[PDB]
Amino acid sequence: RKVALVTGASRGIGAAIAQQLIQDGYFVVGTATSESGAQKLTDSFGAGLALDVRNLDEIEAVVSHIEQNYGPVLVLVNNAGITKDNLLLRMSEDDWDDILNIHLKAVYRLSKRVLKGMTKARFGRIINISSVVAHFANPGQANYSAAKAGIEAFSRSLAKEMGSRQITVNSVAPGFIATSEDIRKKMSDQVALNRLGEPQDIANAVSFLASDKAGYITGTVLHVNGGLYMA
Amino acid sequence: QERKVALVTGASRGIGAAIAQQLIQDGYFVVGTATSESGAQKLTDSFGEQGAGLALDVRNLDEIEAVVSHIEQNYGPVLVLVNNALLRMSEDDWDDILNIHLKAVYRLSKRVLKGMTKARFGRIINISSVVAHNYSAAKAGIEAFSRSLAKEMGSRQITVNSVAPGFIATEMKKMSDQVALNRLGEPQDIANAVSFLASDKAGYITGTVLHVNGGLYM
Amino acid sequence: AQERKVALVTGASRGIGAAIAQQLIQDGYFVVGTATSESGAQKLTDSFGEQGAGLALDVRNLDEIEAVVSHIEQNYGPVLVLVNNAGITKDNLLLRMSEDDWDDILNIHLKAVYRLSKRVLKGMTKARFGRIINISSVVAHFANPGQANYSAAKAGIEAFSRSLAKEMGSRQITVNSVAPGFIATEMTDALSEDIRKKMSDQVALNRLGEPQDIANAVSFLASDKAGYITGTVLHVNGGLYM
Amino acid sequence: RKVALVTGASRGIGAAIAQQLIQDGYFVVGTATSESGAQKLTDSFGEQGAGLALDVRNLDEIEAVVSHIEQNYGPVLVLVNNALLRMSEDDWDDILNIHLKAVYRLSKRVLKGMTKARFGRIINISSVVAHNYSAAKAGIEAFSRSLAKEMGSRQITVNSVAPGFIAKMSDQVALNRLGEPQDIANAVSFLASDKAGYITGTVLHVNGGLYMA
Numbered sequence: 001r002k003v004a005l006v007t008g009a010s011r012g013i014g015a016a017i018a019q020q021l022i023q024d025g026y027f028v029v030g031t032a033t034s035e036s037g038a039q040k041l042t043d044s045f046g047a048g049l050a051l052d053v054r055n056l057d058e059i060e061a062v063v064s065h066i067e068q069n070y071g072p073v074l075v076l077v078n079n080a081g082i083t084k085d086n087l088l089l090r091m092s093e094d095d096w097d098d099i100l101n102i103h104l105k106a107v108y109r110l111s112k113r114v115l116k117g118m119t120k121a122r123f124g125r126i127i128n129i130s131s132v133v134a135h136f137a138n139p140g141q142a143n144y145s146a147a148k149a150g151i152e153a154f155s156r157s158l159a160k161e162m163g164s165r166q167i168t169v170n171s172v173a174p175g176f177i178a179t180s181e182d183i184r185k186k187m188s189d190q191v192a193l194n195r196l197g198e199p200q201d202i203a204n205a206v207s208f209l210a211s212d213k214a215g216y217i218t219g220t221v222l223h224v225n226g227g228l229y230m231a
Numbered sequence: 232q233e234r235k236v237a238l239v240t241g242a243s244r245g246i247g248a249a250i251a252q253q254l255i256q257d258g259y260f261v262v263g264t265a266t267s268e269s270g271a272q273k274l275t276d277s278f279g280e281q282g283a284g285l286a287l288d289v290r291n292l293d294e295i296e297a298v299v300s301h302i303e304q305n306y307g308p309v310l311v312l313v314n315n316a317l318l319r320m321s322e323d324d325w326d327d328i329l330n331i332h333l334k335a336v337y338r339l340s341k342r343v344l345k346g347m348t349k350a351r352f353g354r355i356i357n358i359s360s361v362v363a364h365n366y367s368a369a370k371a372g373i374e375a376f377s378r379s380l381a382k383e384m385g386s387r388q389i390t391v392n393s394v395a396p397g398f399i400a401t402e403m404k405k406m407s408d409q410v411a412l413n414r415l416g417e418p419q420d421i422a423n424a425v426s427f428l429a430s431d432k433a434g435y436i437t438g439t440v441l442h443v444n445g446g447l448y449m
Numbered sequence: 450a451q452e453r454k455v456a457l458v459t460g461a462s463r464g465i466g467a468a469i470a471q472q473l474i475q476d477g478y479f480v481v482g483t484a485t486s487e488s489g490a491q492k493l494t495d496s497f498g499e500q501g502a503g504l505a506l507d508v509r510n511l512d513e514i515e516a517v518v519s520h521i522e523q524n525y526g527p528v529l530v531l532v533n534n535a536g537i538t539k540d541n542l543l544l545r546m547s548e549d550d551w552d553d554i555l556n557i558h559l560k561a562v563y564r565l566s567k568r569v570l571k572g573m574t575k576a577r578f579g580r581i582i583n584i585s586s587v588v589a590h591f592a593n594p595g596q597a598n599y600s601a602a603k604a605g606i607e608a609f610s611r612s613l614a615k616e617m618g619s620r621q622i623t624v625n626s627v628a629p630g631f632i633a634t635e636m637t638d639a640l641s642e643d644i645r646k647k648m649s650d651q652v653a654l655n656r657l658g659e660p661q662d663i664a665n666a667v668s669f670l671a672s673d674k675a676g677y678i679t680g681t682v683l684h685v686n687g688g689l690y691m
Numbered sequence: 692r693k694v695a696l697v698t699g700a701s702r703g704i705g706a707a708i709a710q711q712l713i714q715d716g717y718f719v720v721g722t723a724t725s726e727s728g729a730q731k732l733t734d735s736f737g738e739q740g741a742g743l744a745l746d747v748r749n750l751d752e753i754e755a756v757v758s759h760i761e762q763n764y765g766p767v768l769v770l771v772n773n774a775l776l777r778m779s780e781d782d783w784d785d786i787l788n789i790h791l792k793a794v795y796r797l798s799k800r801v802l803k804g805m806t807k808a809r810f811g812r813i814i815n816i817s818s819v820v821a822h823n824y825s826a827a828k829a830g831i832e833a834f835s836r837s838l839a840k841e842m843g844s845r846q847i848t849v850n851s852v853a854p855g856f857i858a859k860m861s862d863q864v865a866l867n868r869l870g871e872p873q874d875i876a877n878a879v880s881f882l883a884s885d886k887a888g889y890i891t892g893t894v895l896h897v898n899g900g901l902y903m904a
């Protein structure tokens with residue numbers, strides 16, 4: 001069983017991805033911010049670990065541990081949902097740094113860390129979860145938008161570098177995903193499919209990318225937003 | 232015949248052939264079309280029980296309508312439609328290129344629209360051409376057109392997507408140096424993309440271009 | 450007395466930053482440019498004459514940024530054209546990209562943009578006039594290896610610009626990005642030739658660009674002739690990326 | 692003076708574009724669908740422009756007009772091409788023919804003169820937003836890129852300009868107001884000049900923040 005590591009697995013999009021990767025035949029390590037969260041994950045499967053994506057030493061702890069115990073990480077899903085929206089005039093340095101750290105830096109550190117296993121193995125999937133706001137301006141989301149756009153760019157670069165070693169690096173960019181009724185309808189009017197998304201939709205795409213069926217897809221953003229944004 | 236019907240234009244060889252074979256494993260009844268009767272006869276032989284080969288020249292509108300009607304009568308509504316593949320040139324050559332690559336897609340999409348609207352399910356997938364050994368006009372045209380169709384067909388729960396191959400093995404090779412994964416694709420790689428798009432796992436993906444080129448272009 | 454509007458151009462010593470600063474002068478802005486050293490700043494003064502002023506600034510340091518903007522308002526006027534420009538790189542394959550290679554590049558490019566942007570808004574919201582032009586790069590969209598940190602920073606700049614353009618619209622402040630491609634620079638001058646040609650093969654126009662090309666683009670957006678363009682990316686790459 | 696051809700110059704955006712190109716210093720030939728319309732254009736241009744009748748439907752008119760321009764005024768070095776559902780094939784054929792077929796023919800026709808002078812600008816303006824992924828607009832934008840790659844070798848630039856709301860609609864716009872024809876003419880004048888020599892294959896959006904790409 002190739003092992004797959006899914007950060008932010010406790011709920012929503014992350015939970016759906018970890019479950020789906022189980023069904024796909026992967027042994028799945030899901031992580032959560034606190035130890036309450038990691039044990040549930042242990043239960044939902046039958047391995048969860050607590051990880052703060054902001055800390056380098058924790059990241060080194062978890063990955064080093066997994067390679068000893070289960071096997072080298074061969075599918076890495078970087079998923080994070082935390083937001084700290086504010087208009088720029090009201091957005092603090094801490095508000096900026098936190099979101100940049102949790103979304104973008106974490107992708108750099110974990111992607112850097114797993115390369116070794118993937119390179120030896122002749123096989124690798126790094127799948128980064130971005131968002132449609134990387135491309136759609138929404139106010140109060142300066143920090144979140146920038147982080148997600150940075151992840152997509154990062155993925156393209158990393159895809160060039162590691163392609164020789166048969167490792168694919170892609171981003172999946174969810175649209176309006178479910179998780180005020182008027183706010184909901186205004187979001188819906190924009191989507192061509194005329195509805196909001198569900199985490200299963202993202203899990204389905206990540207599963208595809210994670211499989212042998214997507215061995216020739218790399219350096220791409222796969223959009224899953226029902227026509228909200230086309231490109 | 233019980234299964235949902237998928238129609239794959241130009242299913243004779245390579246990518247077309249591979250797409251149609253996959254859609255069959257996926258559980259669709261597949262009608263693969265070739266330009267000539269001899270070509271369609273071959274398809275019928277190879278699909279066997281779970282398909283049929285029909286002759287179609289995608290250029291003629293009456294032939295387009297005749298073929299879908301024949302399918303509608305014999306097999307069932309067309310729920311999946313896969314349209315398989317220098318401007319300083321003659322005007323005729325250009326018009327021919329856009330009749331085949333763009334007008335046809337428009338015609339077949341309009342033609343099958345009703346059946347998909349009724350079932351409230353539909354897949355339209357357009358395969359752009361293989362890269363020669365980026366900003367090609369046919370590809371660009373086709374991808375811009377998929378986005379627009381997708382905007383219109385969306386309310387009815389129909390997805391329109393294109394799939395862009397890079398270098399795929401035809402026959403043949405340092406073109407592969409240009410590819411990040413460092414090799415040429417296989418037709419099956421495009422087949423796998425189409426199958427994911429064609430299935431119930433891709434219900435919220437539309438207006439998109441799914442690139443299958445190993446990082447040739449990003 | 451000085452009666453021109455003030456433009457601040459960060460990283461104006463050489464290449465693209467230099468050309469931008471020289472051109473905005475010709476456009477009739479009073480241009481303050483920055484350099485990484487006091488000696489670098491001096492040269493800018495000896496170049497901007499009585500039409501501009503040089504200042505030393507390490508864009509990674511917040512206090513230093515607050516001090517410089519404060520000093521501009523104190524000696525020259527509010528900053529109504531902000532051009533965030535930075536050329537510094539720290540290339541490496543992710544295998545050998547350290548934490549500091551990452552942090553430092555993200556701080557110089559993306560962070561600086563956030564900090565300087567934020568510090569000049571109110572001074573722009575007051576005069577109801579405003580231009581923030583953020584220099585991006587084509588490697589934000591054009592996969593390039595060994596530049597993961599620089600590509601992420603630049604792509605982030607573009608998205609940040611879109612988001613701010615939305616919040617600052619009511620106030621008549623435009624926020625755009627300009628994204629140069631393969632521009633002949635001091636750094637591009639150092640490379641081999643079959644490789645510079647390798648770069649040019651990819652460009653549709655079949656040549657490398659000039660800093661003046663980027664200066665021309667920024668002057669246009671900075672001027673009264675682009676008052677209805679905001680939240681966009683202006684690509685100046687000769688067809689490298691379409 | 693270098694010659695600029697501006698189709699559909701009779702009113703609004705096309706009119707503003709022709710006037711700005713004159714100020715910039717080009718000799719401007721504006722086209723109108725009928726002969727009186729062309730005469731009107733001629734009157735308004737003073738002695739620095741001319742008006743010709745051209746119904747862009749007919750390719751045959753394009754040969755006569757460009758030839759007419761070549762013989763009387765000079766070679767065309769700047770060419771501005773000015774401006775959708777389930778409807779009959781015919782409506783589609785007509786829109787495409789105006790928005791895309793005419794452009795192709797015009798672009799092909801001025802290509803040798805631009806090629807010989809080592810200078811060229813083709814600038815395609817898409818239609819205003821009504822009242823995004825509209826087919827004519829998407830098509831024209833896609834077409835401009837393809838033309839850009841092919842024509843780049845000859846130092847000819849091909850770009851697109853995409854207006855938003857040009858004179859609530861205003862509430863959707865970031866700058867909170869409608870644009871003016873002059874907004875488009877300014878963008879066009881920039882691209883048409885020696886300032887924009889390294890810009891090709893792009894779409895210059897001038898929508899006040901309506902859409903951000």
Ligand SMILES: CCOC(=O)c1c(CN(C)C)n(-c2ccccc2)c2cc(Br)c(O)cc12
Binds near residue numbers: 372376
């Ligand atoms: C069948 C509808 O599409 C077209 O007829 C053409 C398109 C595709 N666009 C609309 C997305 N294109 C097109 C082709 C390549 C790139 C962009 C647009 C056309 C170009 C010319 Br010229 C023409 O006469 C017709 C079409």
